[PDB]
Design goal:
Chain B: It is found in: Virion membrane; Host cell membrane. The structure is cut from a larger assembly and holds chains A (222 residues), B (373 residues), C (216 residues) and D (72 residues). Helices cover 0% and strands 50% of the residues of chain A. Chain A has 222 residues and is mainly beta. The longest helix of chain D is centred in the C-terminal third of the chain and has 21 residues. Classes of the chains: A mainly beta (222), B alpha+beta (373), C mainly beta (216), D alpha+beta (72).
Chain lengths: 222, 373, 216, 72
């Protein structure tokens, strides 16, 4: 049982964008398919539904006339075409399976996909620039000194930051992103390590930004 | 309703003929000598027809070379009891065949596993003088083959029991078929009487066959597997193709559609392949309901129809109907009921087997009689 | 279209407590209501349907009650993995299938006796300076109370309106917090000063601790 | 495509198209035989239980043969 969704991204207000969702593991041709969106940090919002035969489509009032739902049972896909997008449409969209099979009355969602993020902001997509927050040379001999990475000027969210490709996890703090005055995001990832370890073990942070296909490895040295 | 128009014929005439040819002096020895080598052989019968012949059970071999030698040799007391059970096997079949023939007067409708096993039936089908399409069709639907074939107990002599298994021959295959469902179509006036009812009588199955239409009025004599309709050409009329026009227009001049007139204001429900027709008249309760949400529709007086999508139950008065949950697309052809085209005072209140042209002619006669005054 | 309201918007309860949340409908939806539980950063999972019929696999501690217009979802013993958001949803005739506002469920915070923050300061890198921007980072590590003041002083002059704070959530191991205050300036404005400092005031500190550095 | 159905409210009748034909145009006869034995129906000691059971089974078999003979 699996619903894999695709087609997300960033799209300027007023333009169009089509989401697709492929199903595998069940008799897709007999289940009604829902589209349900969720704004960042807010609750769930029902978007649309299409019956098992594809001859009954229902849309929410806030997306009526703009969105259009379609299905293809020969390939087990559901497509949601959204044109004339407002900024309030920025959300994470799930495709979901209807609990009850082979009906014209729709009941609820029991199998949910992972979702596709749709951002409407007029700003473009920019990969992040990674700057090293290098350890101070005053650090005591003991001494528990600290270093890190500054992931600056990226859009949209999110970026994932690891250390030594995951080999370093203890004492790592990756802060939540902040929205800079430029309209782009920025965060910091800091690690506290024994001062006697500097100059002996290589410290590299790995920054990943999927929306821009950006993979950065930043080596931090004193 | 058109079952009386069909012609009558002998169903087992061929098997009985093969039996009467099997009673000739020397024919059972012919078959036995042919099957002396293998368990199946083609034999030219004395009537000229060549038939396939099977030896489905060999008891003389077992009795005379495996049981009696060990029994009556010396010290008739036997040392192993597994022989008793081994003989209860290979003998139950003969007893069951005898009993089936006793209860069915010697000719049994659907051919059981005791008469003919699935391996033997498939072996018989695969070695028949028919095209490969019919072989595949028969092999995939062995149950319908058993239902549509006979087994006539033929003769028992010369240490051999013989019965003729008379199998169907599916000569016509893959041509398009359609079922026609009908329901009474009455007026909806509130008066206690003067309520005329009209119905179509050509209900049943129809299949294209050699430029004509084979029509089966008794749809009960037609089996359906998935979308294949197994019917018997003997329980059928043969009509011109123009009869299909009765669906696009019932007043067409080419074909005359048989109808029925009455004055019986009875509410009914006729469940079709994908949906249900409801003739709701009088003060009767007519309801369409879903299994998970209850009643979803109340029918107004008249002839209406619902699709099987979303509707799981049709209630008419006290009768409950479960709709077929087969997948497909339904279509609603809007139109005015034909019953609104006739005068209730001049309408023939009763005619069992009539047609559009006949009713129109009687109306013309009565109107010509009335106009003279 | 029917409107659905959940009560309470959020709640904070200890592990093992009996939690009862309520859902109310605009009209009669007699039993066409589902309960979903969305764990933090996960997909919504269907907890139960028909307002009382538990879904197969759901732990028996969940119990749905109610009918007509009023329904309740009850957790007899709140568990760690029971945190998140809970949504009631009606499925009446011909969907506008509206959800509810949701109910946030979180475990109470840890006691965590007071711990003073480790304060670090990072000057802007040379690579970042080559592009015309300077970002000084003041880091507070592993302290608990949650409250702390971080102020920026450039040449002993207090700054205002050009610094951004970002704070982590309470750690699952030591129940402490971390905060980063980043001060961003232009290269010309950054080179227009001598000494940069961040001053931290916090319960675990005897005196407001100032960490400073000279450019160079 | 697949099975479709049209309901004519005009004449209050439904037609269900999309089915395929398999019509019994004729018959095929086939003789099927079972070879029997004319076992000599006696002469063993009915002292054993296994022998008595086999003798009863032989009685069943010959009575079946006799019943089949009476079907004429």
């Amino acid at each position: 049982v699996q619903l894999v969704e695709s087609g997300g991204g960033v799209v300027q207000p007023g333009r169009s964008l089509r989401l697709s969702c492929a199903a595998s593991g069940f008799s897709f041709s007999h289940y009604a398919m829902h589209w349900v969106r969720q704004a960042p940090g807010k609750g769930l919002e029902w978007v649309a539904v299409i019956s098992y035969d594809g001859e009954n489509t229902y849309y929410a009032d806030s997306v009526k006339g703009r969105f259009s739902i379609s299905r293809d049972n020969s390939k087990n896909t559901v497509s949601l075409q959204m044109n004339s997008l407002r900024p309030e449409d920025t959300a994470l969209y799930y495709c979901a399976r209807d609990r009850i099979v082979d009906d014209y009355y729709y009941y609820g969602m029991d199998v949910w996909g992972q979702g596709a993020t749709v951002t409407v902001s007029s700003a473009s997509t920019k990969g992040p620039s990674v700057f090293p927050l290098a350890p101070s040379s005053k650090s005591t001999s003991g001494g528990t000194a600290a270093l890190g990475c500054l992931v600056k000027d990226y859009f949209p969210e999110p970026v994932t930051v690891s250390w030594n490709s995951g080999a370093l996890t203890s004492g790592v703090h990756t802060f939540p992103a902040v929205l800079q005055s430029s309209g782009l995001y920025s965060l910091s990832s800091v690690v506290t390590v024994p001062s006697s370890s500097l100059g002996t073990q290589t410290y590299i942070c790995n920054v990943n930004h999927k929306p821009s296909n950006t993979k950065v490895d930043k080596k931090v040295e004193p | 309703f058109l079952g009386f128009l069909l012609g009558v014929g002998s169903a087992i005439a061929s098997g009985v003929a093969v039996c009467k040819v099997l009673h000739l002096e020397g024919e059972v020895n012919k078959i036995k000598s042919a099957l002396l080598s293998t368990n199946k052989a083609v034999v030219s019968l004395s009537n000229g027809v060549s038939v396939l012949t099977f030896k489905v059970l060999d008891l003389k071999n077992y009795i005379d070379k495996q049981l009696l030698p060990i029994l009556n040799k010396q010290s008739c007391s036997i040392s192993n009891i597994e022989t008793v059970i081994e003989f209860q096997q290979k003998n139950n079949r003969l007893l069951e065949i005898t009993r089936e023939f006793s209860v069915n007067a010697g000719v049994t409708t659907p051919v059981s596993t005791y008469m003919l096993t699935n391996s033997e039936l498939l072996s018989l089908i695969n070695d028949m003088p028919i095209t490969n399409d019919q072989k595949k069709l028969m092999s995939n639907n062995v149950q319908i083959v058993r239902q549509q074939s006979y087994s006539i107990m033929c003769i028992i002599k010369e240490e051999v029991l013989a019965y003729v298994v008379q199998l169907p021959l599916y000569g016509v295959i893959d041509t398009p078929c359609w079922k026609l469902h009908t329901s009474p179509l009455c007026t909806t006036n509130t008066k206690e009487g003067s309520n005329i009812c009209l119905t179509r009588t050509d209900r049943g199955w129809y299949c294209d066959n050699a430029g004509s239409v084979s029509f089966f009025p008794q749809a009960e004599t037609c089996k359906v597997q998935s979308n294949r309709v197994f019917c018997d050409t003997m329980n059928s009329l043969t009509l011109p193709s123009e009869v299909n026009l009765c669906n696009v227009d019932i007043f067409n001049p080419k074909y005359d559609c048989k109808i029925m007139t009455s004055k019986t204001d009875v509410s009914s429900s006729v469940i079709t392949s994908l949906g249900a027709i409801v003739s709701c008249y009088g003060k009767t309760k007519c309801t369409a309901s879903n299994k998970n949400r209850g009643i979803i529709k109340t029918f107004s007086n008249g002839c209406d129809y619902v699709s099987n999508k979303g509707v799981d139950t049709v209630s008419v008065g006290n009768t409950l109907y479960y709709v077929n949950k087969q997948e497909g697309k339904s279509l609603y052809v809007k139109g005015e009921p034909i019953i609104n085209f006739y005068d209730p005072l001049v309408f023939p209140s009763d005619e069992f087997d009539a047609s559009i042209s006949q009713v129109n002619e009687k109306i013309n006669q009565s109107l010509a009689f009335i106009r003279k005054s | 279209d029917i409107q659905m309201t959940q009560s309470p918007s959020s709640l904070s309860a200890s592990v093992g407590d009996r939690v009862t949340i309520t859902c109310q409908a605009s009209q009669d939806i007699k039993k066409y209501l589902n309960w979903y539980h969305q764990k933090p950063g996960k997909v919504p999972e269907l907890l139960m349907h028909d307002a009382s019929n538990l879904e197969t696999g759901v732990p028996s501690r969940f119990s749905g009650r109610g009918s007509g217009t009023d329904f309740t979802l009850t957790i007899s013993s709140l568990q760690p993995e029971d945190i998140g958001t809970y949504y009631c949803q009606q499925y009446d005739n011909l969907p506008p299938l509206t959800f509810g506002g949701g109910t946030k469920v979180e475990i109470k915070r840890t006691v965590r006796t007071v711990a003073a923050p480790s304060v670090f300061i990072f000057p802007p890198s040379d690579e970042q300076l080559k592009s015309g921007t300077a970002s000084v980072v003041c880091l507070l590590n592993n302290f608990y109370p949650r409250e702390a003041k971080v102020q920026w002083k450039v040449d002993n002059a207090l700054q205002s309106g050009n610094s951004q704070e970002s704070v982590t959530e309470q750690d699952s191991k030591d129940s402490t917090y971390s905060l980063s205050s980043t001060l961003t300036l232009s290269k010309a404005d950054y080179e227009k000063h001598k000494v940069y400092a961040c001053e931290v005031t916090h319960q675990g500190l005897s005196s407001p601790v100032t960490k400073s550095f000279n450019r160079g | 495509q697949n099975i479709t159905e049209e309901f004519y409210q005009s004449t209050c009748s439904a037609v269900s198209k999309g089915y395929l034909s398999a019509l019994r145009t004729g018959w095929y006869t086939s003789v099927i035989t079972i070879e029997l034995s004319n076992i000599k129906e006696n002469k063993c000691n009915g002292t054993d239980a296994k022998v008595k059971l086999i003798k009863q089974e032989l009685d069943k078999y010959k009575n079946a043969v006799t019943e089949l003979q009476l079907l004429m």
